[PDB]
């Protein structure tokens, strides 16, 4: 098969939209964020809502309907938190993960940098490679949904190859030319 990780910054939107699609279509998948904090959209783009990764989805749900029941229903954040609850109790920091993956996919170049920086700085024990791929997905419901379906077609495509390492780059190129989107690609080592 293919053990996949999906990674973005807050482990809320894009990365959970992909978690959800991959999980329901039979992939073994985990999702994480890399950002310093968990950020939910707030009253104004300059003042988001900020949490620690220890914080439950359910918790954020009530911290938010304590703020403005109305603002978080209309902007879909409450429905998202409820959807995330059903997958996983709390968001997770990539830098604290200890499990191994075959393929880590990132949803923003900045995160790709954080994943690379993190994996390059760890104790290398084994030299087992893990492939890291980026696709920039804007942070909104629509793009996140679209980006999850694209990530799913990608993994489904990678899973049909006979030899992943030998042909992943040809597939990513096929995918850039079909999708109009660029796919950065690198390897880190365990």
């Amino acid at each position: 098969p293919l053990r996949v990780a999906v990674v973005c910054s807050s482990n809320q939107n894009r990365s959970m939209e992909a978690h959800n699609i991959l999980s329901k279509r039979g992939f073994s998948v985990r999702s994480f964020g890399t950002g310093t904090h968990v950020k939910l959209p707030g009253p104004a783009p300059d003042k988001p809502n900020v949490y620690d990764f220890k914080t439950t989805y359910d918790q954020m749900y009530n911290d938010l309907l304590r703020k403005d029941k109305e603002l978080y229903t209309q902007n879909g954040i409450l429905h998202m938190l409820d959807r995330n609850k059903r997958i996983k109790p709390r968001p997770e920091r990539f830098q604290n993960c200890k499990d191994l993956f075959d393929l880590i996919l990132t949803c923003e170049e900045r995160v790709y940098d954080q994943v690379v920086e993190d994996l390059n700085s760890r104790e290398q024990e084994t030299c087992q490679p893990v492939h890291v791929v980026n696709v920039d997905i804007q942070d909104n419901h629509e793009e996140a949904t679209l980006g999850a379906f694209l990530i799913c077609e990608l993994c489904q495509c990678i899973q049909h190859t006979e030899d992943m390492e030998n042909e992943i780059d040809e597939l990513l190129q096929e995918f850039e030319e079909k999708s109009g989107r660029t796919f950065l690609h690198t390897v880190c080592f365990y």
Partner: protein, 311 residues
């Protein structure tokens, strides 16, 4: 029911299972004879190893892993097992080959430590070492493999060979995990069989092979980023090599490989930036600071980021 009985039963079972599930049962046998009671390892050795012939890729990968652990538990076993390993390195399946490369990455050091710690050395043990040494030679040749995965594993193997076959120096930056790893400087100049100077030359030649690889005009994106990263490690752990690494960076930045696709070019070049910054922080980079800085700036590195990575 003892361990030996609990093992005979697990094997009778494994001899009858017709699929990959048999690996579970094999992994349990592994734990029981390598960890929970090594006195039984010899009794059941031939019988685990015979699984090397199984048609299943995964069963074959499990056998290489078992070899790796048996040899860490009792390095003398390498007298027999090195043939099996070299043959599994020549497996028709790329995933078995790649596992073989990773196991050699571990065992080479271990075997060399055993040759060095050994006072008197039998002809057989000498031959065993020649085997290990030539298998390292084979894996170096795997840099010309036509498979991108084999190449990447070959690079990592070659990377560790260069670190192992060169001396730790006062300004070497050494990772916690590899603290107790043999290195050239730990090898007595007057050893009865291991020749300090033959080894020093074999590391130099290994590093020459890698530098040649970097300049293949058909080099793949992933192979190049891997090779870039291995040179950053070598450079930090073995700063007598700083000058060659910087020159390899220089060469790449004049001569960008023209089969790379646009995004591949971007991927590789984001790593070149990262490895230049990581090397700049090393004290032994002093001489070449402006040569590195020219390179970094040319790739659009901003100066708050350049300046965060001085030593």
């Amino acid at each position: 029911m003892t361990t030996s009985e609990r093992v005979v039963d697990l094997l009778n079972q494994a001899a009858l299972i017709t699929n990959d599930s048999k690996i579970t049962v094999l992994k349990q046998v592994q734990e029981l004879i390598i960890n929970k009671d090594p006195t039984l390892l010899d009794n059941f050795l031939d019988e685990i190893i015979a699984f090397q012939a199984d048609k299943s890729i995964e069963v074959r990968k499990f056998v290489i892993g078992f070899i790796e652990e048996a040899c860490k538990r009792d390095i003398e076993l390498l007298l027999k097992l090195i043939a099996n390993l070299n043959m599994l390195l020549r497996d028709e399946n790329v995933n078995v080959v790649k596992k073989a490369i990773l196991t050699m990455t571990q065992l080479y050091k271990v075997a060399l430590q055993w040759m060095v710690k050994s006072r008197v050395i039998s002809e057989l043990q000498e031959a065993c070492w020649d085997m290990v040494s030539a298998m390292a030679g084979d894996i170096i040749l795997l840099l010309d493999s036509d498979n991108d995965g084999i190449r990447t594993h070959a690079i990592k193997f070659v990377e560790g060979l260069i670190v192992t076959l060169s001396p730790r120096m006062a300004d070497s930056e050494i990772p916690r995990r590899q603290e107790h790893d043999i290195s050239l400087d730990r090898i007595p100049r007057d050893h009865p069989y291991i020749q300090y100077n033959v080894l020093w030359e074999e590391g130099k030649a290994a590093l020459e092979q890698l530098l040649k690889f970097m300049v293949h005009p058909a080099i793949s994106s992933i192979n190049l980023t891997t090779a870039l990263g291995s040179l950053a490690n070598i450079a930090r752990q073995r700063p007598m090599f700083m000058s060659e690494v910087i020159q390899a960076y220089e060469t790449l930045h004049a001569n960008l490989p023209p089969t790379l696709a646009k995004s591949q070019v971007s991927s590789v070049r984001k790593n070149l930036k990262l490895h230049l910054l990581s090397v700049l922080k090393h004290p032994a980079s002093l001489e070449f600071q402006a040569q590195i800085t020219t390179l970094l700036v040319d790739l659009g590195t901003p100066q708050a980021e350049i300046a965060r990575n001085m030593p």
